[PDB]
Design an enzyme around this catalytic site. Structure first.
Site, PDB file in Angstrom:
ATOM      1  N   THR A  42      28.686  48.985  38.232  1.00  0.00           N
ATOM      2  CA  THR A  42      29.594  49.028  39.391  1.00  0.00           C
ATOM      3  C   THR A  42      30.096  50.459  39.668  1.00  0.00           C
ATOM      4  OG1 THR A  42      30.337  46.741  39.142  1.00  0.00           O
ATOM      5  CG2 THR A  42      31.829  48.227  40.305  1.00  0.00           C
ATOM      6  N   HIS A  45      27.577  52.217  41.862  1.00  0.00           N
ATOM      7  CA  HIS A  45      27.704  51.702  43.226  1.00  0.00           C
ATOM      8  C   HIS A  45      28.936  52.211  43.940  1.00  0.00           C
ATOM      9  CE1 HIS A  45      24.213  49.182  42.839  1.00  0.00           C
ATOM     10  NE2 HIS A  45      24.727  48.452  41.835  1.00  0.00           N
TER      11      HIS A  45
END
Ligand SMILES: [Cl-]
Ligand SMILES: [Zn+2]
Length: 343
Positions: A42, A45
């Site tokens: 994450t 991202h």
């Protein structure tokens, strides 16, 4: 003015170590000296704007540390205590929160995303987000409570119990922690599928009863086929890779009456085919699993009692100065969990 290092996402694409002020806790905050903070997929991202954030912001949402200051209204946890942080702050006032679905809070704010997080020497942790864990623990183990909690929620949803058969798709840290939780929850067959030899070997060290290599042949046949490991399919399939092929195969891996859990994040907007005839006639369940509602304490307890193997999940320990490069580049081949150790 006392300073610290912090890994800052300045704006989409722009990440570096900066000197910032050591934050001062509000009345219900703890100031925590970080012992370790894990790097998540994450985080890559977030860097590239694929998940939203509120830059400029210090990344890091998988952390533990020692309380060094308590706000005026905190009487409960004192400096010297070790805590792990639940990064997910729910609002308590929206319809999801009032129905107890705190993970679906419409006003969710996450430490390391909307608020400064754990890739720093110190982090602010609102009292309600702090879970005390023993001082006798290995200093870095607390950093695994967040990813463990996300996997534990998925295992809870799956219905795994004594005697279940389980297939886990993906050899990342999520797949591997879920192998361990599947076994702990009573599964007597736990199969992990991954193309990486190193991850299959690790899966077997931490509880997988078998592993399969998708390069060697069709995984549906190898697991659920007539001469497969579990002919007719498994009770529970947990997709951990967030990859279209394995999401697609998951229902065909499940026995009739079985359960698929979608734990891995496939890109937003991306589509995969289901066969509604098969879902109906074989009475399947397909379940989304999102973060960590009401499981952080159980996860922290599992870490506290040594029920989970943590040391084997740590592939590398890096400094704050090394973090931007690791986050800015794709995960390395043998990467399981990289820990950022501020000192
Ligand atoms: Cl994975
Ligand atoms: Zn809410």
């Amino acid at each position: 003015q006392s300073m610290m290092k912090a890994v800052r996402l300045e704006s989409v694409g722009n990440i570096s170590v900066r000197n910032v002020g050591i934050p001062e806790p509000g009345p219900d905050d703890l100031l925590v000296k970080v012992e370790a903070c894990g790097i998540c997929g994450t985080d890559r991202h977030l860097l590239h704007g694929e998940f939203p954030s509120t830059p400029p912001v210090t990344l890091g949402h998988e952390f533990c540390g020692i309380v060094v200051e308590a706000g005026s209204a905190v009487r409960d946890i004192a400096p010297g205590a070790r805590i792990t942080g639940d990064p997910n702050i729910s609002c308590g006032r929206c319809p999801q929160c009032q129905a107890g679905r705190v993970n679906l809070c419409r006003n969710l704010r996450a430490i390391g995303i909307h608020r400064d997080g754990g890739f720093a020497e110190y982090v602010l942790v609102p009292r309600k987000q702090a879970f005390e864990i023993p001082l006798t623990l290995d200093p870095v183990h607390g950093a695994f409570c967040e990813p463990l909690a996300c996997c534990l929620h998925g295992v809870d949803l799956s219905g795994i119990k004594a005697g279940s058969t389980v297939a886990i798709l993906g050899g990342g840290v999520i797949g591997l922690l879920t192998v361990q939780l599947a076994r702990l929850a009573g599964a007597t067959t736990v199969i992990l599928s991954t193309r990486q030899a190193t991850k299959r070997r690790l899966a077997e060290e931490v509880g997988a009863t078998a592993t399969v290599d998708p390069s060697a042949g069709d995984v549906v046949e190898a697991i659920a086929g007539p001469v497969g490991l579990v002919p007719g399919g498994v009770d529970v399939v947990i997709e951990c890779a967030g990859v279209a092929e394995t999401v697609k195969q998951s229902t065909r891996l499940a026995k009739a009456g079985g359960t698929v859990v979608i734990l891995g994040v496939l890109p937003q907007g991306e589509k995969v085919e289901i066969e509604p005839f098969d879902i109906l006639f074989r009475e399947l369940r397909v379940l989304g699993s999102f973060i960590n509602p009401f499981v952080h304490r159980r996860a922290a307890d599992l870490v506290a009692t040594g029920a989970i193997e943590i040391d084997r999940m740590i592939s590398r320990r890096i400094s704050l100065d090394e973090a931007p490069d690791v986050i800015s580049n794709p995960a390395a081949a043998g990467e399981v969990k990289v820990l950022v150790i501020p000192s």
